[PDB]
Amino acid sequence: HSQGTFTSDYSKYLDSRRAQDFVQWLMNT
C-alpha cells in the first residue's frame, strides 16, 4: 500500500558505490 516499498529501491545502490569504492583500494595507482 500507501507505505509501499520505495525504500528497498535505493538501499541497494549504496551496495554498489562502496563496491566501486573498494575498486580504489585494490588499485588507486
**Technique behind the model:** X-ray
H or E segment and range at residue 12: helix 7-20
Number of H helices, E strands in the chain: 1, 0
What does this entry list as its resolution, in Å? 3.0
CA distance from start to end of the chain: 49
Amino acid letter, residue 17? R
Cell of 4: 509501499
CA dist 25 and 2 (Å) reads 42
